[PDB]
Design a binder for this molecule. Structure first.
Ligand SMILES: O=C(O)C[C@H](O)C[C@H](O)/C=C/c1c(C2CC2)nc2ccccc2c1-c1ccc(F)cc1
Ligand SMILES: O=C(O)C[C@H](O)C[C@H](O)/C=C/c1c(C2CC2)nc2ccccc2c1-c1ccc(F)cc1
Ligand SMILES: O=C(O)C[C@H](O)C[C@H](O)/C=C/c1c(C2CC2)nc2ccccc2c1-c1ccc(F)cc1
Ligand SMILES: O=C(O)C[C@H](O)C[C@H](O)/C=C/c1c(C2CC2)nc2ccccc2c1-c1ccc(F)cc1
Lengths: 357, 357, 357, 357
């Protein structure tokens, strides 16, 4: 209604193509990104039609060729290694010695259940896992890690940090809270702390392609792919001084799935973090392929996940909304689907390159 | 038509919310992301209504508060430092000594005009700027850099690499082209080569906020902001082992503008690269604020830029399509608008945090 | 005797300057590095004459000027944040799922006392602190961390890894031990895992210089130094894409002390890791200066620590040999002396630069 | 004489072992490090007895086993890729736009011969190669690169920076020189700018070991070594978030040679930067092994190179003093000897690990 009057305000230059009617509502319209399907992606038993919101189009095709090569090869096996969202306030004291005392306090086992109880009023779903106090001079970067059910859970983890931050004025009234975020989290930035430590769902996803299928179907060899993986994704990314960028195009696939399933597209910068491994097995006859992804940040609940169209795309994958089984399970399964689509993407583009030789 | 029949194929589980009718066309539908406006953004003289495709909504508001604080403070001044898209094939020889000879050849000035002529049949718009051969053992990572007009120009730079790669079999028939990309570019990955060297448009954007406006309007002080910038964006990102992540949330703003203007959302991982500087000036009375962004990768031509809705959003900014003035100027101006919206974003969220103390 | 005959073998070109007589003994001689003294370094109460083995000479002077400025300013306060040496074997399995099972096993609390008992036959002094299994495809990088008394303790931690690696063939006979080191430790290399996680003694060291002393003695101001620290050591090292290099010259001081006290000079690459913080305190009247150093790797026992000359230099500092008080205390105190000399070094050179303006 | 009286001052606690007599002279004594020989190292035709100053002793043995395996395998071939020492002042202006104008000025070709003439009064040997102005907000980090003959040449490059910095007050009187170093050089710190760009001598060194020698002599296989190189030195260093640390122990060998030849042992942090490549050649029959080292910083002239003992060690290698042939050639040849000894070190320890399986 108003958003309709606000559009004519702006043209009084033309924003004519931008549709207004079609979406249920400071909005001035909406853009449209077409959705392609990659599948079947055979993953931990189940088949998935992977929705990919993208303009490219040759990317849906490329991810498709990868899902097929894995479909006839046994499919993919994902393993969730760690599941927990993080927020890291920077606080400070008058001294590093004093700041150290907050560290040793927070990192004492015997204090945990108290810090936990305080943190977990943040919601029904907040369950604090750990606290890592990093000291730099008289400043402390306190990394809180917690499970958050099927929500990506950034407000939740913040309600909880503030709970423990208020509770801490009892013992530490000299503490100055400089920021609710000190970039030690690290949110929507590439950071070693996320690579080393994990942020959100840390996933590994693997498949074995048989020599016969690498020749007949990918029109390359086991040895050519193992070598191209070492020279491009490992030695190449190393020579370029990459952080977490030891892969061919995880970012294309992660972005496309994120935008279709209504994730935060800015969290794609650390969610795209990936090492691609390609290892000759069975006296060089077959290839073991994996993606290891320490910081896939997704939810099936909240944000853009509950818009009509994005909701339809989660529902296709059967992860729409909170888990009935147990809270967190739909968000965990979404992460493995991303790791699986990434693995297919790596295999397709890595074969295309190696085959082109 | 077919895409309509393909949707029912998939439900034979429900993808009901996903709209089908509304977009002109393997598409199975399209998703809808609402567009907010941040402005006026006063930048290098002109005012802009900045389209931001996002679900958050508090992000459009936050970027708005920043554009206003800069509107009453003189507005922002952008400077384009470097403009050129890169592709880096990995080739190899039997020896490092032999690979060195390709390096010293390519990097000889007197060879450039020949390599240029060969490269520039890629299109009317391809103009090769440089070639940087990095040797690792007997492998060479040859970074080609070229201007590409108003197209982001990744196909163009590839047509050109292949031109020079074929031409090189004259002098180097022993060369094996292992990959058209060796991850030394580095495309859709965070890499030191992009931070150090630049990729696409390298922009700096700056404003001065007066003490009076920092107190009256941002409800903080000059000293509080300079300090929070050092502890969060500099010392914080350092303690976290960040690469290019010396900022608060460039990624939120870059993503939102990228998705609205039909850019490649996976290029957000290196386009979000940013150092935020906040420096007390005029005997501590005022604050100089900047973003330095070495790798903003955008075009106003091709890909998703020519869909109805994304086109309407570029046209709002007056950068839609190729430059009349001269090829490249619309893509350059789009980059500065991104740097300007990022600066507003940094100022808003950095003030909100500092003010909260 | 033989080493004397072996020298003439080599000249049959002249190695005449290289002394032979003077050292008690495949040695062919010995080189001589002159030792300077920086002090008094007033640190956690005590005064130290800091031995610095260096050719420069202007470096001993520069470190001296820093120790004096801190002597009249109250001296330095060190805090040991973490103390533990690490070794990280790479092992592998046929699958990532299988490799995950070693991770979840090792990282189960209830298994720790068993892994501990097995590990701690390595010596009287080996006390295992933790095990962090990082999975990459079907490979596992198992980071063992342990206290090792006053020895730097790299053989000790290795005897212990092999203990747990043999013990693991019970439950994991399918495990292949690919290497006793998989570069995830990371020994004598700069690595994010050491910055984020710590390796050996993690130290913070701090002093307050009064406005009066910054003007009268360092011939600069509080504001000039805070600013130069932000532009050089923080924004500068960031623009350069530094890892752990957020300081002016920790490496000069660490090297000089390491070579004099008979440490391993190749461990200087991660022992020099340092963030220098300089913060205005007391309404801008005074400056809080610190070094935070996550990976100082030293011992007072074994290796070159027990040569005549290197031993004399440890004995000057009163840390020579194993701790009577309790095992580890001399190696811990040596680390704080290094952090203190580094802080003096930073203050001296950072003042010299700022004063030169 | 005085240094003799200064020793008794300090004991009035015992520094008895530290020798006083034996060295020609604020010195209070000297320490002694024993020198071992690794060789013959067969490199670019010539044989070398490589002096290694180290306490370990098992390290000289390990480097010896590598030199022998290469002696019977054809020896090593080094290639110098780039030769130039760098200093990077941070200067600033009132604006980024203004700072940009210094960048575009300095980086204009037509200005170079003038900047060169000004720079090159620094000495007979200073020959300026390039200037790279990096802008961050209103600050500029100007990387000067120059040849410096056989001196490591850090004073020389500084005399030259100051020459151009004074000359710049003509055109840029508004410039503030904040520091003669802004950590963008980056001296005695690990930095992406050194990895990407090079600092001092950038060397590649390669050898081919035949299947027969890998079995008979190194007691492993071609395939085992290629694999261990990928899992340890590449995937391992990547998982650890390494910068320039894509090798097993370059730092051990670089340190040992640096200390014996009187180099600056603090420059070992960036001189140890290394990617180790191991590639199966000749239908998997043989192994191509290399080290690529972008920042070996050495001189044969000045500093500790002209002490009796360190001089004797350079003279063994035939690189002592300035080049007769042409200035720089002895310092260049020393770098290749370091790269060669590193390659031998990698081969020995990498074989020992792989063979242990
Ligand atoms: O390679 C990288 O470092 C990442 C890459 O840039 C991301 C980009 O979206 C992918 C581009 C791409 C694709 C896209 C379908 C995803 N398909 C191909 C099929 C056959 C042969 C090459 C390609 C290339 C392709 C074409 C030219 C290249 F130089 C590289 C890849
Ligand atoms: O801070 C960072 O490292 C990046 C951040 O995570 C990205 C995130 O999209 C921003 C979250 C955010 C916002 C969003 C409008 C963009 N607005 C605020 C307004 C007042 C106070 C805090 C915030 C926070 C906010 C709330 C809680 C926090 F912990 C941090 C920021
Ligand atoms: O600055 C850095 O990034 C690290 C530096 O390179 C390490 C080097 O050993 C130090 C060089 C140095 C020294 C040495 C005594 C340690 N003293 C000075 C005193 C007054 C003014 C400058 C200096 C400089 C000095 C001279 C010229 C410079 F460009 C920088 C520092
Ligand atoms: O591996 C790394 O990441 C680097 C390493 O730490 C540096 C260290 O100076 C080397 C230690 C070393 C050596 C030294 C002679 C240099 N020799 C061996 C011979 C046979 C088998 C193992 C080793 C190990 C050795 C022993 C135990 C290990 F865990 C690793 C290497």
């Amino acid at each position: 209604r108003a958003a309709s009057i606000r559009r004519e305000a702006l043209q009084r230059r033309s924003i004519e193509g931008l549709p207004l009617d079609g979406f249920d509502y400071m909005p001035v319209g909406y853009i449209q990104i077409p959705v392609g399907i990659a599948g079947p992606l055979l993953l931990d038993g189940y088949e998935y039609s992977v929705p990919m919101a993208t303009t490219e189009g040759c990317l849906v095709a490329s991810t498709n060729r990868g899902c097929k090569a894995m479909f006839i090869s046994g499919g993919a096996t994902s393993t969730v290694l760690k599941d927990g969202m993080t927020r890291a306030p920077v606080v400070r004291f008058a001294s590093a010695r004093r700041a150290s005392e907050l560290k040793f306090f927070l990192e004492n086992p015997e204090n945990f259940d108290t810090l936990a109880v305080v943190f977990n009023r943040s919601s029904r779903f907040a369950r604090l896992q750990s606290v890592k106090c990093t000291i730099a001079g008289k400043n402390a970067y306190v990394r809180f890690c917690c499970s958050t059910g099927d929500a990506m859970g950034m407000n939740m983890v913040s309600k909880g940090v503030q709970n423990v931050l208020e509770y801490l004025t009892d013992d530490f009234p000299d503490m100055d809270v400089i920021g609710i975020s000190g970039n030690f989290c690290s949110d929507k930035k590439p950071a070693a702390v996320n690579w080393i430590e994990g942020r959100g769902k840390s996933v590994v996803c693997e498949a074995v392609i048989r020599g016969e299928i690498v020749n007949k179907v990918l029109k390359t060899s086991v040895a050519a792919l193992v070598e191209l993986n070492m020279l491009k994704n490992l030695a190449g990314s190393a020579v370029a001084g990459s952080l977490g960028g030891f892969n061919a195009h995880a970012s294309n696939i992660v972005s496309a799935v994120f935008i279709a399933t209504g994730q935060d597209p800015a969290q794609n910068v650390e969610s795209s973090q990936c090492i691609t491994m390609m290892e000759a097995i069975n006296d060089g006859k077959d290839i073991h392929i994996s993606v290891t992804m320490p910081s896939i940040e997704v939810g099936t609940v909240g944000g853009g996940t509950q818009l009509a169209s994005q909701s339809a795309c989660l529902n296709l994958l059967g992860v729409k909304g909170a888990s009935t089984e147990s809270p967190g399970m739909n968000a965990r399964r979404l992460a493995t689907i991303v790791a699986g689509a990434v693995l297919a993407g790596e295999l397709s583009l890595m074969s295309a390159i190696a085959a082109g030789q």
